[PDB]
């Protein structure tokens, strides 16, 4: 019973909390052990989903959350209408507006190292990349930041928010070196 598990529990809602646990089960994984990496889907998930409240009603297509095979069947879908072609790796969102899929990240170390290992993990020429940082850094593809600048600085303000909890608990320098 560590002191981050409980810290996940009551700084995310129970839904992200849900989600996050489900996730980590699905790669055999137990939040219960990898307390860090539970803080850590549990941030991505948050950020997903702010991002996807950041554009017009139904600009973004959800593919986070989602268990393996309904994420991909979504994808297949988003492709086999759009003509985009398909990912090697799951993204997070589909843009409409744009027409492209995003795989969002969030960082504890600089921006510009992240982003240069999702791309060459992604290994997908077509998804945009979004990286955000806990310190208010944001790195995107093609300089394109995809949302305006207020929902990008509402993530940022959570970012930033979530880091302070942390650290007045004495639990941030394990997390910023665990990643
Ligand atoms: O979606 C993801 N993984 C499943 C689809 S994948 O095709 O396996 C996939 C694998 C790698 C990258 C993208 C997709 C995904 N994973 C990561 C990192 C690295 C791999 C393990 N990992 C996590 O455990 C994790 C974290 Cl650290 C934060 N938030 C969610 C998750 Cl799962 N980083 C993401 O940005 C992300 O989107
Ligand atoms: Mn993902
Ligand atoms: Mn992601």
């Given at each position: 019973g560590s002191h981050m598990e409980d810290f996940v529990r009551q700084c995310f809602n129970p839904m992200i909390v849900e989600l996050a646990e489900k996730a980590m089960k699905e790669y055999g994984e137990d939040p219960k052990i990898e307390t860090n990496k539970f803080?850590?889907?549990?941030?991505?998930?948050?950020?997903?989903?702010?991002?996807?409240?950041?554009?017009?009603?139904?600009?973004?297509?959800?593919?986070?959350?989602?268990?393996?095979?309904?994420?991909?069947?979504?994808?297949?879908?988003?492709?086999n209408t759009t003509g985009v072609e398909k990912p090697k790796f799951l993204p997070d969102l589909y843009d409409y507006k744009e027409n492209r899929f995003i795989d969002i990240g969030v960082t504890r170390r600089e921006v510009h190292i992240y982003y240069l290992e999702k791309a060459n993990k992604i290994k997908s020429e077509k998804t945009h990349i979004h990286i955000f940082s806990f310190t208010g850094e944001?790195?995107?593809?093609?300089?394109?930041?995809?949302?305006?600048?207020?929902?990008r600085a509402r993530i940022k303000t959570r970012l930033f928010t979530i880091r302070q909890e942390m650290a007045s608990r004495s639990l941030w320098d394990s997390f910023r070196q665990s990643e």
């Open positions: 803080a850590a889907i549990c941030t991505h998930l948050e950020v997903c989903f702010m991002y996807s409240d950041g554009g017009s009603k139904h600009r973004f297509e959800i593919i986070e959350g989602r268990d393996r095979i309904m994420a991909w069947t979504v994808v297949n879908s988003i492709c944001e790195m995107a593809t093609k300089a394109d930041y995809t949302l305006d600048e207020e929902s």
